[PDB]
Design a protein around this motif. Structure first.
Motif, PDB file in Angstrom:
ATOM      1  N   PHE A 290       0.831  -1.241   0.000  1.00  0.00           N
ATOM      2  CA  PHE A 290       0.000   0.000   0.000  1.00  0.00           C
ATOM      3  C   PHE A 290       0.836   1.249   0.000  1.00  0.00           C
ATOM      4  CE2 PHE A 290      -3.630  -2.661   0.749  1.00  0.00           C
ATOM      5  CZ  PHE A 290      -4.691  -1.958   0.143  1.00  0.00           C
ATOM      6  N   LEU A 291       1.874   1.258   0.868  1.00  0.00           N
ATOM      7  CA  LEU A 291       2.756   2.391   0.944  1.00  0.00           C
ATOM      8  C   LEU A 291       3.298   2.807  -0.497  1.00  0.00           C
ATOM      9  CD1 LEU A 291       5.437   3.321   3.568  1.00  0.00           C
ATOM     10  CD2 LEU A 291       5.783   3.653   1.059  1.00  0.00           C
ATOM     11  N   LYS A 292       3.890   1.853  -1.207  1.00  0.00           N
ATOM     12  CA  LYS A 292       4.496   2.172  -2.501  1.00  0.00           C
ATOM     13  C   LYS A 292       3.436   2.448  -3.588  1.00  0.00           C
ATOM     14  CE  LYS A 292       9.193   0.840  -1.998  1.00  0.00           C
ATOM     15  NZ  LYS A 292      10.272   0.023  -2.619  1.00  0.00           N
ATOM     16  N   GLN A 293       2.293   1.755  -3.514  1.00  0.00           N
ATOM     17  CA  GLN A 293       1.227   2.064  -4.465  1.00  0.00           C
ATOM     18  C   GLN A 293       0.599   3.443  -4.269  1.00  0.00           C
ATOM     19  OE1 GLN A 293       2.612  -0.499  -6.302  1.00  0.00           O
ATOM     20  NE2 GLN A 293       0.606  -0.067  -7.416  1.00  0.00           N
ATOM     21  N   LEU A 294       0.306   3.778  -3.023  1.00  0.00           N
ATOM     22  CA  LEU A 294      -0.334   5.047  -2.756  1.00  0.00           C
ATOM     23  C   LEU A 294       0.637   6.218  -2.898  1.00  0.00           C
ATOM     24  CD1 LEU A 294      -2.658   4.108   0.235  1.00  0.00           C
ATOM     25  CD2 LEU A 294      -3.305   4.597  -2.286  1.00  0.00           C
ATOM     26  N   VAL A 295       1.950   5.965  -2.764  1.00  0.00           N
ATOM     27  CA  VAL A 295       2.950   6.973  -3.117  1.00  0.00           C
ATOM     28  C   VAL A 295       3.001   7.240  -4.623  1.00  0.00           C
ATOM     29  CG1 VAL A 295       5.444   7.451  -3.185  1.00  0.00           C
ATOM     30  CG2 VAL A 295       4.272   6.782  -1.030  1.00  0.00           C
ATOM     31  N   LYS A 296       2.944   6.199  -5.433  1.00  0.00           N
ATOM     32  CA  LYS A 296       2.973   6.474  -6.890  1.00  0.00           C
ATOM     33  C   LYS A 296       1.607   6.997  -7.401  1.00  0.00           C
ATOM     34  CE  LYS A 296       4.176   2.268  -7.484  1.00  0.00           C
ATOM     35  NZ  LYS A 296       4.505   0.910  -7.871  1.00  0.00           N
ATOM     36  N   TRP A 297       0.525   6.680  -6.699  1.00  0.00           N
ATOM     37  CA  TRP A 297      -0.833   7.116  -7.146  1.00  0.00           C
ATOM     38  C   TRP A 297      -0.812   8.588  -7.606  1.00  0.00           C
ATOM     39  CZ3 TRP A 297      -5.400   8.227  -3.240  1.00  0.00           C
ATOM     40  CH2 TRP A 297      -6.585   8.372  -3.942  1.00  0.00           C
ATOM     41  N   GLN A 298      -1.357   8.792  -8.784  1.00  0.00           N
ATOM     42  CA  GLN A 298      -1.297  10.118  -9.384  1.00  0.00           C
ATOM     43  C   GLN A 298      -2.582  10.374 -10.133  1.00  0.00           C
ATOM     44  OE1 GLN A 298       0.724   9.847 -13.670  1.00  0.00           O
ATOM     45  NE2 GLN A 298       2.250   9.664 -11.994  1.00  0.00           N
ATOM     46  N   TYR A 299      -2.893  11.676 -10.314  1.00  0.00           N
ATOM     47  CA  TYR A 299      -3.930  12.157 -11.271  1.00  0.00           C
ATOM     48  C   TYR A 299      -3.192  13.211 -12.141  1.00  0.00           C
ATOM     49  CZ  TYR A 299      -7.853  10.422  -8.416  1.00  0.00           C
ATOM     50  OH  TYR A 299      -8.743   9.611  -7.736  1.00  0.00           O
ATOM     51  N   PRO A 300      -3.297  13.081 -13.485  1.00  0.00           N
ATOM     52  CA  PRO A 300      -3.984  11.980 -14.102  1.00  0.00           C
ATOM     53  C   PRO A 300      -3.231  10.648 -14.124  1.00  0.00           C
ATOM     54  CG  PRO A 300      -3.126  13.394 -15.807  1.00  0.00           C
ATOM     55  CD  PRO A 300      -2.598  13.921 -14.500  1.00  0.00           C
ATOM     56  N   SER A 301      -3.902   9.634 -14.614  1.00  0.00           N
ATOM     57  CA  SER A 301      -3.438   8.212 -14.495  1.00  0.00           C
ATOM     58  C   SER A 301      -4.148   7.457 -15.606  1.00  0.00           C
ATOM     59  CB  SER A 301      -3.850   7.639 -13.108  1.00  0.00           C
ATOM     60  OG  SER A 301      -5.249   7.366 -13.070  1.00  0.00           O
ATOM     61  N   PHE A 302      -3.857   6.177 -15.845  1.00  0.00           N
ATOM     62  CA  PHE A 302      -4.530   5.441 -16.905  1.00  0.00           C
ATOM     63  C   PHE A 302      -5.986   5.395 -16.600  1.00  0.00           C
ATOM     64  CE2 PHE A 302      -6.723   1.651 -18.667  1.00  0.00           C
ATOM     65  CZ  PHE A 302      -6.537   1.885 -20.002  1.00  0.00           C
ATOM     66  N   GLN A 303      -6.335   5.354 -15.331  1.00  0.00           N
ATOM     67  CA  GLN A 303      -7.724   5.234 -14.881  1.00  0.00           C
ATOM     68  C   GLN A 303      -8.456   6.573 -14.978  1.00  0.00           C
ATOM     69  OE1 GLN A 303      -8.906   2.487 -14.609  1.00  0.00           O
ATOM     70  NE2 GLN A 303     -10.774   2.474 -13.443  1.00  0.00           N
ATOM     71  N   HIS A 304      -7.702   7.633 -14.718  1.00  0.00           N
ATOM     72  CA  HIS A 304      -8.211   9.009 -14.659  1.00  0.00           C
ATOM     73  C   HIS A 304      -7.449   9.949 -15.608  1.00  0.00           C
ATOM     74  CE1 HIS A 304     -10.541   7.477 -11.277  1.00  0.00           C
ATOM     75  NE2 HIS A 304      -9.432   7.191 -10.624  1.00  0.00           N
ATOM     76  N   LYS A 305      -7.868   9.942 -16.875  1.00  0.00           N
ATOM     77  CA  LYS A 305      -7.203  10.784 -17.910  1.00  0.00           C
ATOM     78  C   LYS A 305      -8.196  11.427 -18.869  1.00  0.00           C
ATOM     79  CE  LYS A 305      -6.426   6.712 -20.878  1.00  0.00           C
ATOM     80  NZ  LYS A 305      -7.389   5.827 -20.194  1.00  0.00           N
TER      81      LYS A 305
END
Length: 584
Positions: free
Chosen positions: A99-114
C-alpha cells in the motif's frame, strides 16, 4: 464533464478489506473482461465474491479501487491482468508496504483518470504525497478538514495556497464563540466552498450530497493513509508519523506525476511494480543496517519491560525466530521480510509497554474516565469522542475495553481484531465474523465482545454473533489441540435482559462460557487493579482466571430466573473484589 475532486473509494472503506477481494479477482486473470464479451467473467467473479466469509466477515465499483491502486488492469486485447503489486497483495506479502508504494505512486492523471474529465491544465497531483506536504504546513487534518479542503485539490503545486486557506479558516472559526456556533460556521463555510466548486451560475440538497460524499471519502482516506504507516492519529487529527521523518522527506523529494499514462501497458509496467519507487536505503547493505537498527529498538523495549512484565518473553522469542532467517540467506528480499515482521513485532512490544505506562495512575484513570463517558447520553458520547479520536465511538469502545484488558495484565497476547495504526490508535471496527478482541493467557483465553447497543437492537446485533464467535473459536482450538478453556466477556453499558438470558441458555445447554458484565462492573475491575498498584501489588494471571471461572460457574449453577442469575453474578463479582482487600 471535468471532475473536481479525487477520492479514496469507500468500497471498501478500510484497506485491509481489499486483500480477500483481490485474491478472488486474481482467479480471473486471463479472462476476457472488456465490454459485452466481458460479461460472463465479471458475472462469475461478482458471484464467487459474494461467497466469502465476508458474508459472515456495484461490481465495477468493487473493482475500480483495485484498478486505481494499480493492482489490476485490462490489457488492450481486453483481458484481466494482475500486476506484480496485485500478486504480492493477493499473496498477502508485506501488505502495508505494498500500500505504501502504491499510494505513493498514485497520481492524477493516471490510466484510470485521464483525458476529458482530467485535463493536464488543472490536474497534476499525487494525493498521498500532497497530504504529506500539507501536513508539513498545517500540523494535522481531521476527517472534516480533508473532506472540505484536500479532496478538491487537483495539483501538487496547490499545497501552500490550500494550507493558507485552512489556517485562515481556523483563525476565523476561532473567533466564533459557542461550540454549536462553531459547528454552524464550519458547516456553512463547507456549504459555500462546495457551492463555488460544484456551484457555477433543489440546489441546496444537491451540494449537501457532495458534502456527505466527501465526508465518506475523507474517512476512507484517513484509514488508507494510516495503513501505510506514514501517517498516525493524534487525537482527532491525521498527522505525520514522527518515526518516518526521513522516508517522508525522501518520498516528497522523489515523487512525480509521470507523463506516459495514456497507454495501459507502459503505465502499469511502472505503476504495478511494487519495487518502485526505490528508496535510498533499499540496498542489501542498508537493509541490513535497517534490520539491525529495528532489532536494537526491540531489544531495548523488551529489556526495559522484562523484569516487571515477563509476558514480553513471547515477543523476544518471535524476534529471534524472525532474525534466524538471515543465518540461511542474506538477500534484499529476505531482509525486507525480516524488517516487515520486526516492525509488526515492535507493535506487539508497544502493546505490552502500555502495561508499564499504566503504572502511572493518571494514565490508568484516563482509560477509566473515557469508559465512563459511555454512561452519558448519545449526543454527549459522540461529542466527547469526536474531539479525542478519528474513529467513531463504536470502534473507540472496542479500543478502550482492550486497553482495559492491558491494565488487568498477564496476557500472552492482547489480540485486537479491530485495526490500530502505528501509534496504536484505533482505525476500523472488528469484522462481523470476529470477536472485538481475543485475549490469550497462559492457560485460558477470553474473547472480548463489546457493544454500545441497547434493548432489542442489542439482542438483534449481538445474540447470534457472540455465540457464533465463541463456538467457532472453541471448534478451532479443538482442531489445533490447544487445551485452554475459552470464555467470552460481553460488555455493554446496559446489558439487555433478552441478550443476557440467551447467553445463559447457551452456557447451560450448548456448553458455552459467555459472561455478561455491565460497563460499570468492567470499570470496577479496572478500579480494583488501580488500587492494587497504589499498594505495590497487581492482579496475577490466576486472579483473572479465577474471576472468569467463578462468574462462569455462577452462570450454570445459579437458579434459572433472570433476576437470580443476575444477582448471583453481582455476588460472585463482589466476593472476588473483597478478596483483593481494596478500597472498592
Amino acid at each position: 464533464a471535468k471532475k473536481v475532486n479525487w477520492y479514496v473509494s469507500s468500497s471498501p472503506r478500510s484497506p485491509e478489506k481489499i486483500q480477500p477481494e483481490l485474491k478472488v479477482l486474481a482467479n480471473f486473470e486471463g479472462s476476457y473482461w472488456k465490454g459485452v464479451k466481458g460479461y460472463k467473467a465479471q458475472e462469475a467473479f461478482a458471484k464467487e465474491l459474494a461467497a466469502l466469509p465476508q458474508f459472515l466477515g456495484s461490481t465495477r465499483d468493487r473493482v475500480a479501487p483495485m484498478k486505481t491502486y494499480g493492482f489490476v488492469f485490462v490489457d488492450e486485447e481486453g483481458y484481466l491482468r494482475i500486476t506484480e503489486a496485485g500478486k504480492m497483495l493477493a499473496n498477502n506479502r508485506r501488505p502495508k508496504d505494498v500500500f505504501l508504494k502504491q499510494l505513493v505512486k498514485w497520481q492524477y492523471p493516471s490510466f484510470q483518470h485521464k483525458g476529458k474529465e482530467y485535463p493536464e491544465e488543472e490536474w497534476s497531483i499525487n494525493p498521498l504525497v500532497f497530504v504529506l506536504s500539507l501536513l508539513k504546513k498545517v500540523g494535522g487534518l481531521s476527517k472534516l478538514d480533508i473532506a472540505m479542503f484536500s479532496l478538491t485539490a487537483t495539483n501538487n503545486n496547490q499545497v501552500d495556497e490550500i494550507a493558507e486557506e485552512i489556517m485562515q479558516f481556523r483563525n476565523e472559526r476561532e473567533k466564533i464563540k459557542g461550540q454549536n456556533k462553531k459547528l454552524e460556521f464550519t458547516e456553512n463555510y463547507f456549504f459555500k466552498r462546495f457551492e463555488k466548486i460544484y456551484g457555477n451560475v433543489s440546489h441546496k440538497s444537491k451540494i449537501e450530497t457532495k458534502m456527505r460524499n466527501a465526508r465518506d471519502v475523507a474517512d476512507a482516506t484517513t484509514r488508507y493513509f494510516r495503513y501505510t504507516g506514514l501517517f498516525v492519529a493524534r487525537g482527532n487529527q491525521l498527522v505525520l508519523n514522527p518515526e518516518k521523518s526521513d522516508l517522508i522527506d525522501e518520498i516528497i523529494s522523489s515523487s512525480k506525476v509521470v507523463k506516459n499514462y495514456t497507454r495501459v501497458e507502459e503505465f502499469h509496467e511502472y505503476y504495478g511494480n511494487p519495487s518502485l519507487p526505490q528508496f535510498s536505503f533499499e540496498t542489501k547493505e542498508q537493509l541490513l543496517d535497517l534490520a539491525h537498527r529495528i532489532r536494537d529498538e526491540n531489544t531495548r523495549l523488551a529489556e526495559q519491560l522484562v523484569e516487571h512484565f515477563p509476558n514480553v518473553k513471547v515477543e523476544i522469542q518471535v524476534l529471534e525466530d524472525i532474525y534466524n532467517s538471515l543465518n540461511k540467506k542474506v538477500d534484499v528480499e529476505t531482509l525486507k521480510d525480516v524488517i516487515y515482521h520486526a516492525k509488526e513485532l515492535q507493535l506487539e512490544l508497544k502493546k505490552k509497554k502500555l502495561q508499564a505506562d499504566f503504572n502511572d495512575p493518571r494514565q490508568l484513570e484516563e482509560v477509566i474516565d473515557l469508559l465512563e463517558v459511555y454512561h452519558e447520553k448519545k449526543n454527549v458520547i459522540e461529542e466527547k469522542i469526536k474531539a479525542r479520536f478519528i474513529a467513531n465511538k463504536n470502534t473507540v469502545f472496542e479500543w478502550l475495553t482492550w486497553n482495559g484488558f492491558i491494565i488487568l495484565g498477564n496476557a500472552l497476547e492482547y489480540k485486537n481484531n479491530f485495526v490500530i495504526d502505528e501509534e496504536l490508535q484505533p482505525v476500523t471496527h472488528a469484522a462481523g465474523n470476529q470477536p472485538d478482541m481475543e485475549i490469550i493467557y497462559e492457560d485460558f483465553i477470553v474473547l472480548g465482545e463489546v457493544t454500545t447497543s441497547k434493548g432489542a437492537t442489542q439482542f438483534k446485533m449481538e445474540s447470534e454473533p457472540v455465540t457464533r464467535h465463541y463456538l467457532n473459536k472453541k471448534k478451532e482450538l479443538e482442531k489445533q489441540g490447544v487445551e485452554k478453556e475459552l470464555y467470552s466477556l460481553f460488555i455493554a453499558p446496559e446489558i439487555n435482559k433478552n441478550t443476557f438470558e440467551e447467553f445463559m441458555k447457551y452456557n447451560i445447554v450448548q456448553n458455552t462460557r459467555i459472561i455478561p458484565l455491565s460497563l460499570k462492573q468492567f470499570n470496577m475491575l479496572l478500579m480494583v487493579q488501580k488500587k492494587l498498584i497504589e499498594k505495590g501489588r497487581r492482579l496475577s494471571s490466576y486472579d483473572i482466571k479465577n474471576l472468569m471461572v467463578s462468574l462462569y460457574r455462577t452462570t450454570i449453577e445459579s437458579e434459572r430466573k433472570y433476576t437470580q442469575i443476575k444477582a448471583g453474578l453481582e455476588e460472585t463479582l463482589n466476593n472476588w473484589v473483597v478478596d483483593k482487600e481494596v478500597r472498592f
